């Protein structure tokens, strides 16, 4: 043959979940400030639930998603949301686990708190989800988007 271990399993989810969408202000983050913001750019951050139960924050150039986003944040790794303030009045840093952190910022405190609450939610929930998934096999899922072309 080649490889493969009788397909997979333990794939599926249950109940609804969370979500959130809006234009945020992603940054580069670094020592200095001018670098931390490196020209704070605005992008449409869309939240989507992976085909398992986890949540991934994917941001696009605009609201029109569906297509390939600019990137995706593995909240599954996200450690927690911190509060910068230095950069901007309403700016929070995402403490990732893959050695790195994103500089998010909203237009208003709310838009800044909401995310801080959303991400944190999935972040904190991600912790309880692990222990929940660990002892939870029975589950059904489905994934299939853009197989291939030319």
Going from the C-alpha of 79 to that of each of 16, 46, 82, 88, 101, the distances in angstroms are 23, 19, 10, 21, 10
| Ordered strands of the 80-83 beta sheet | 80-83, 91-95, 101-105
What kind of experiment solved this structure?
NMR
Would you state the structure tokens that stand for residue 61, as one six-digit string? 């150039």
Is residue 129 classed as helix, strand or coil in its secondary structure?
Answer: helix
Which positions ≥6 away from 126 have C-beta within 8 Å?
Answer: 54, 55, 75, 76, 78
Do residues 72 and 122 lie in contact, with contact meaning Cβ atoms separated by under 8 Å? no
C-alpha neighbours within 13 Å on the C-beta side of residue 60: 13
DSSP state of 39: S
> What contacts 24+ positions apart, CB below 8 Å, involve 98-101?
98/74, 101/29
- C-alpha span between 119 and 125 (Å, rounded): 9
Measured in whole angstroms, the distance separating CA 47 from the mean position of its chain's CA atoms is: 6
């Amino acid at each position: 043959g080649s490889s493969g271990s009788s397909g997979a399993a333990s794939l599926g989810s249950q109940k609804g979940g969370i979500t959130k969408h809006g234009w945020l202000y992603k940054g580069n983050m670094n020592s200095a400030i001018s670098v931390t913001m490196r020209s704070f750019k605005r992008r449409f951050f869309h939240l989507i639930q992976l085909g398992d139960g986890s949540y991934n924050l994917n941001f696009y150039k605009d609201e029109k998603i569906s297509k390939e986003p600019k990137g995706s944040i593995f909240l599954d790794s996200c450690m927690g949301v911190v509060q910068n303030n230095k950069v901007r009045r309403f700016a929070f840093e995402l403490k990732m686990q893959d050695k790195s952190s994103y500089l998010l910022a909203a237009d208003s405190e709310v838009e800044m708190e909401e995310w801080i609450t959303i991400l944190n939610k999935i972040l904190q929930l991600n912790f309880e989800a692990a222990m929940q998934e660990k002892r939870n096999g029975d589950s059904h899922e489905d994934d299939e988007s853009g197989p291939s072309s030319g």
